[PDB]
Amino acid sequence: EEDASQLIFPKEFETAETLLNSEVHMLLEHRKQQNESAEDEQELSEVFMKTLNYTARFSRFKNRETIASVRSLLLQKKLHKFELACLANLCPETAEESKALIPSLEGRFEDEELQQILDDIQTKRS
Amino acid sequence: NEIRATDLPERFQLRSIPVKGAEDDELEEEADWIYRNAFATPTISLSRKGPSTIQKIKEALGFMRNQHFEVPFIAFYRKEYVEPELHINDLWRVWQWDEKWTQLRIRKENLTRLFEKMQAYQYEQISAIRALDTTDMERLKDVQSMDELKDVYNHFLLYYGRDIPKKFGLTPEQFGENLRDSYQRHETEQFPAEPLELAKDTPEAVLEGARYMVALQIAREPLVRQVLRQTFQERAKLNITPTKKGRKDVDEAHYAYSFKYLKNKPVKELRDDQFLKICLAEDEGLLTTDISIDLKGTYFEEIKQFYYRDEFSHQVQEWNRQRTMAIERALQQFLYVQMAKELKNKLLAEAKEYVIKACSRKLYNWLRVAPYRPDQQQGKGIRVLGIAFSSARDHPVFCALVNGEGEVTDFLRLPHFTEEREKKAQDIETLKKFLLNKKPHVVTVAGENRDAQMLIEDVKRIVHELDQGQQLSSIGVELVDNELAILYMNSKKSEAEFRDYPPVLRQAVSLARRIQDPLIEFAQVCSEDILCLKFHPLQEHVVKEELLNALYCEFINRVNEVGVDVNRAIAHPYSQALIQYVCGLGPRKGTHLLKILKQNNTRLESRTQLVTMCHMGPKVFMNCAGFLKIDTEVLDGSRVHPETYEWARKMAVDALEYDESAEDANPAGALEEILENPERLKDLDLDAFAEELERQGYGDKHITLYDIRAELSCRYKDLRTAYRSPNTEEIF
Amino acid sequence: MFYHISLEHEILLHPRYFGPNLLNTVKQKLFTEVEGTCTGKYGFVIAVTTIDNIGAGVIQPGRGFVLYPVKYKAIVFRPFKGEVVDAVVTQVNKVGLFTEIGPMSCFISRHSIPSEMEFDPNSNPPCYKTMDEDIVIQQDDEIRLKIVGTRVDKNDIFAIGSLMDDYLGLV
RNA sequence: UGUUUUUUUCUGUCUCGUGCC
């Protein structure tokens, strides 16, 4: 029954806080910077390294202010939290591609209304 | 059915997998590809010269495509068309070169088709920085440039777009030409405009908009790849230097840890020296590796002047700055990284080649069949007394007395040993009783440490002093290293021959077999079995597929040179399953022939048994004519095939000066007299034989004349080495 | 998908750890206990960002061990069905494709892949192309996919991908 | 130029009577 396409999740996960690829990337980078210092400490595990090299290959923007602006210009809408991560991470070109990938956008908003948002997201990319 | 009842042999089909045969026009292309890709970095096949080597490779490829020839079948049967004994890796190298040429041709054809389709799509779209379909022809023509061709194709796809519905600085071609020639023939955009004006005509308000496009164009340009290719791969003084943690973790075990400050290792040390490449790969795996040419700091400076404007007064200065920025962006995108990746790939290839060469050398050294038969040739062979003891410390040591016909006659144990702290007679008495129990022909003792060597020496001394070798003579117990017999004792053959026997008996049997017929043991093993023996530590770093292929080729060549006994693999299990590494007779074909022989009960009547009994096809018989041998026609158990049977008979008659009347069996003076010993060699002239072959036969017999004479004079010639007695260092 | 939620956990601290570094020791124990693990309720956990508070240690009767019900603010990665992400191809095989969704590895079969993407076993690098050879997909490429299934192999998530929806490849 | 050993908590039934603080 758990299918994110139809906007359904358990009760505990419904009250979660979404994270973007750049956000998690900078969080892990800062954690690494803090951990590497303060000698006599247990070093990072393979999980941290794989997650780092996995999120580093999808960092659409390095500036934190870019993350702040792209979340601010998005939260003003009426979309759910789930629509804040996938759409901000994939960065599709045209509204048709976004509507095809995410079935929730089908009929939820107009075409130009989503195309303008996608163009803004593309421009915000570094 | 297709492997055993196929028109072409199994080896020929397996060799030309990517290229199903060679056409008349494609033979020249394959030969050119093989010659070009025969020895680029190291010197290989420079023997055969350049043009002569290319011609020989082309002839071998043509023979393989037409007559379904194979590696040994073309190296021996086509000694004239290919290098006449230029090197051992003649047929295999030719097959690899032909396969590479065919693959390159197929890739070039696919690239040309893709380029034509893209050009047609572009013409249809824009015909109703442009997009022209002119590079498709270049990509299709670039058959030799595989990596460069792929890079150019990828760059073209990323530049034109790759979409399939159903003025910023210098041009890319001019920049590439100026970089390749070393002189900047074309400068940047010599216009009054600067990045301020160019960053407003996209919607970014940043001066780095055109830099990204310039970098993408430079990186995705085949000319750039060609110019950078070979510049650092040809020479790269890789400085090996351990890091902070690698110095202690390596402990001077790898290439990047043996020399604390031993840097400046050129490509010769990594390519030619496979050990260095293996060490660098191992060190670069976990801890770290020191692989840096350190030669760019000066190779990247010369490119900086090229593609940039010379004047500086706003327009000229702005153009020069923009060109410098674009060059830097392109270099950072695919300039240093591409060169480093190419150098790493070249180093890995060199390490793999070195590992494969070491494995092939080890296989050639250890595969030569050099048994120790009676008199170093009563009864056929000698009775090898395989003595494979466990400890020699009051424990039962296996001691089997196998016969010389690929079978074990008997065995026994010797629990008494010098067990007892002070007992110098029990071991001697046990050895005397064991020697008197049977009548072996030779002693094959093993060794593990000083105690084992002392026990072997004591046993040999007791046998020689009391004449325990045959009961009526002293027999020298030949030392045998416990290397092949230990592995063969616990193999499938050892288990099948004896199931309810201790491991000592199996080890003794394996040791006895290894010192009687190494070829039989090598052919009767899985090749798994060959992979058990390590050829060198550097082979592990390189791909094991190349080593396995080299070992298989060496085994096939050895089998073809020594031949196969048809009757030996009919009833004797020890000398069975030896039709897997024959020239043109593959494993499936050999298994089918063995099954047919076991069912129908057909014996090795002559060379045409598989052509007359309907067991093997004409191509199979022709390709495997020089490898199948029988016990008894006269020229069946030799390299003389049916085609050269008449020529061999005529040559033997002329040398023996006997009558000529349809000599196949009936005249024996020319056949039996010449087989017994050399009757007359001056009677048979090389020029006369060659002229006869050319006029009637459709082939020159200048190179095959010697082989035919040897086959007529000596049948079933063995290509294995002689018996190698253990030495001091070798014994240890 | 990565998320930031508030979790709770308790750890017994042996009395030998009492002293001026009690809180530091509790934090150190927390770090090396709930990092990298996985559970079927909240999913795979990456690491811990910060800790909310340290509860009151209730010393157990007759045992020196004391438990601290700490509530930490850590991140978690619990992919669901239907989500679309961007991963990287790790290996190409005739049996199927292998990718790496961060701490999880999915797998797509040839059946999911359209018939246009054929095999290239002749070429040294295993790759899939079309008849015209325009589009090329190989390893180390940011290729998208769809999570059509989930699985947890005893705290080891292993989902399954798919390649039927359009616009799934090179961006 | 040598020196012989390694296996271990078992476990018993339901009933009646007598004596003691």
PDB file of C-alpha atoms in Angstrom, chain A residues 2-5 8-10 12-13 15-19 21 24 27-28 31 41-42 47-48 50-51 54 57-58 60 81-82 85-86 89-93 96-97 100-102 125, chain C residues 1-5 28 31-32 35-36 41-42 44-49 75 78 80-88 100-104 140-142 144 146 165-168 171:
ATOM      1  CA  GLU A   2       2.982   2.270   0.661  1.00  0.00           C
ATOM      2  CA  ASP A   3       3.371   4.101  -2.658  1.00  0.00           C
ATOM      3  CA  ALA A   4       4.749   7.640  -2.771  1.00  0.00           C
ATOM      4  CA  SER A   5       3.138   8.118  -6.194  1.00  0.00           C
ATOM      5  CA  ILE A   8       0.591   7.920   1.182  1.00  0.00           C
ATOM      6  CA  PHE A   9       3.079   7.184   3.957  1.00  0.00           C
ATOM      7  CA  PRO A  10       2.968   5.869   7.534  1.00  0.00           C
ATOM      8  CA  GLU A  12       5.490   8.551  11.691  1.00  0.00           C
ATOM      9  CA  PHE A  13       6.952   9.426   8.288  1.00  0.00           C
ATOM     10  CA  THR A  15       5.633  14.357  10.068  1.00  0.00           C
ATOM     11  CA  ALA A  16       9.159  14.117   8.654  1.00  0.00           C
ATOM     12  CA  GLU A  17      11.416  16.918   7.433  1.00  0.00           C
ATOM     13  CA  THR A  18      12.440  16.679   3.773  1.00  0.00           C
ATOM     14  CA  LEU A  19      16.083  17.018   2.743  1.00  0.00           C
ATOM     15  CA  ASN A  21      20.772  16.436  -2.096  1.00  0.00           C
ATOM     16  CA  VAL A  24      22.533  16.423   2.972  1.00  0.00           C
ATOM     17  CA  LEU A  27      25.613  18.381   6.314  1.00  0.00           C
ATOM     18  CA  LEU A  28      27.814  15.331   5.759  1.00  0.00           C
ATOM     19  CA  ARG A  31      30.233  16.437   9.878  1.00  0.00           C
ATOM     20  CA  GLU A  41      38.446   9.679  17.456  1.00  0.00           C
ATOM     21  CA  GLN A  42      36.868   6.767  15.609  1.00  0.00           C
ATOM     22  CA  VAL A  47      28.756   4.103   4.762  1.00  0.00           C
ATOM     23  CA  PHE A  48      29.761   7.736   5.224  1.00  0.00           C
ATOM     24  CA  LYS A  50      29.768   5.979  -0.073  1.00  0.00           C
ATOM     25  CA  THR A  51      27.045   8.456   0.893  1.00  0.00           C
ATOM     26  CA  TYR A  54      26.974   9.525  -3.890  1.00  0.00           C
ATOM     27  CA  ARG A  57      27.760  13.697  -7.873  1.00  0.00           C
ATOM     28  CA  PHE A  58      24.314  15.336  -7.681  1.00  0.00           C
ATOM     29  CA  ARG A  60      23.073  21.105  -8.274  1.00  0.00           C
ATOM     30  CA  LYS A  81       6.509  18.110   1.434  1.00  0.00           C
ATOM     31  CA  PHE A  82       7.176  15.077  -0.766  1.00  0.00           C
ATOM     32  CA  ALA A  85      12.525  17.027  -2.668  1.00  0.00           C
ATOM     33  CA  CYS A  86      12.052  15.086  -5.918  1.00  0.00           C
ATOM     34  CA  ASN A  89      16.532  17.372  -6.980  1.00  0.00           C
ATOM     35  CA  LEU A  90      15.762  16.017 -10.457  1.00  0.00           C
ATOM     36  CA  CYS A  91      15.447  19.498 -12.025  1.00  0.00           C
ATOM     37  CA  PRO A  92      13.503  18.500 -15.166  1.00  0.00           C
ATOM     38  CA  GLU A  93      13.700  20.642 -18.284  1.00  0.00           C
ATOM     39  CA  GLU A  96       5.858  17.554 -19.530  1.00  0.00           C
ATOM     40  CA  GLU A  97       8.850  15.604 -18.209  1.00  0.00           C
ATOM     41  CA  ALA A 100       5.422  12.265 -16.568  1.00  0.00           C
ATOM     42  CA  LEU A 101       7.972  11.363 -13.879  1.00  0.00           C
ATOM     43  CA  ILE A 102       5.750  12.413 -10.946  1.00  0.00           C
ATOM     44  CA  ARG A 125      21.465  25.922 -10.852  1.00  0.00           C
TER      45      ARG A 125
ATOM     46  CA  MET C   1      14.827   9.626   0.339  1.00  0.00           C
ATOM     47  CA  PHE C   2      16.836  11.404   3.023  1.00  0.00           C
ATOM     48  CA  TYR C   3      14.886  12.899   5.921  1.00  0.00           C
ATOM     49  CA  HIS C   4      15.539  14.569   9.267  1.00  0.00           C
ATOM     50  CA  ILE C   5      13.426  13.155  12.105  1.00  0.00           C
ATOM     51  CA  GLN C  28      30.327   8.697  22.351  1.00  0.00           C
ATOM     52  CA  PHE C  31      27.449   7.804  18.131  1.00  0.00           C
ATOM     53  CA  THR C  32      28.851   4.291  17.710  1.00  0.00           C
ATOM     54  CA  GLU C  35      25.104   5.122  12.870  1.00  0.00           C
ATOM     55  CA  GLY C  36      24.867   3.024   9.729  1.00  0.00           C
ATOM     56  CA  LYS C  41      10.264   0.837  10.987  1.00  0.00           C
ATOM     57  CA  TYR C  42      12.223   4.014  10.211  1.00  0.00           C
ATOM     58  CA  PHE C  44      18.281   3.060   6.999  1.00  0.00           C
ATOM     59  CA  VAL C  45      20.015   5.666   9.167  1.00  0.00           C
ATOM     60  CA  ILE C  46      22.966   7.619   7.794  1.00  0.00           C
ATOM     61  CA  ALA C  47      24.378   9.491  10.793  1.00  0.00           C
ATOM     62  CA  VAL C  48      23.474  11.746  13.721  1.00  0.00           C
ATOM     63  CA  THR C  49      23.526  15.534  13.499  1.00  0.00           C
ATOM     64  CA  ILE C  75      18.855  11.819   9.614  1.00  0.00           C
ATOM     65  CA  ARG C  78      13.869   5.282   3.883  1.00  0.00           C
ATOM     66  CA  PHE C  80       9.411   4.151  -0.680  1.00  0.00           C
ATOM     67  CA  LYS C  81       7.697   2.655  -3.701  1.00  0.00           C
ATOM     68  CA  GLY C  82       6.996   4.910  -6.659  1.00  0.00           C
ATOM     69  CA  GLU C  83       9.751   7.402  -5.883  1.00  0.00           C
ATOM     70  CA  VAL C  84      12.086   8.515  -8.665  1.00  0.00           C
ATOM     71  CA  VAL C  85      15.738   9.218  -7.914  1.00  0.00           C
ATOM     72  CA  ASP C  86      18.998   9.718  -9.795  1.00  0.00           C
ATOM     73  CA  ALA C  87      21.620   7.030  -9.229  1.00  0.00           C
ATOM     74  CA  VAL C  88      24.807   5.887 -10.960  1.00  0.00           C
ATOM     75  CA  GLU C 100      23.881   2.307  -6.343  1.00  0.00           C
ATOM     76  CA  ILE C 101      21.225   4.443  -4.601  1.00  0.00           C
ATOM     77  CA  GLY C 102      23.611   5.710  -1.944  1.00  0.00           C
ATOM     78  CA  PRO C 103      23.506   3.200   0.917  1.00  0.00           C
ATOM     79  CA  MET C 104      21.352   0.851  -1.192  1.00  0.00           C
ATOM     80  CA  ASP C 140      29.625   5.650 -14.050  1.00  0.00           C
ATOM     81  CA  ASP C 141      26.678   7.499 -15.603  1.00  0.00           C
ATOM     82  CA  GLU C 142      23.985   9.424 -13.744  1.00  0.00           C
ATOM     83  CA  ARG C 144      17.574   7.739 -13.308  1.00  0.00           C
ATOM     84  CA  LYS C 146      11.945   4.290 -10.451  1.00  0.00           C
ATOM     85  CA  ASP C 165       8.623   5.201 -18.038  1.00  0.00           C
ATOM     86  CA  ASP C 166       9.877   7.721 -20.569  1.00  0.00           C
ATOM     87  CA  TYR C 167      12.569  10.304 -19.757  1.00  0.00           C
ATOM     88  CA  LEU C 168      14.900   7.925 -17.887  1.00  0.00           C
ATOM     89  CA  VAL C 171      19.737  14.468 -18.593  1.00  0.00           C
TER      90      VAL C 171
END
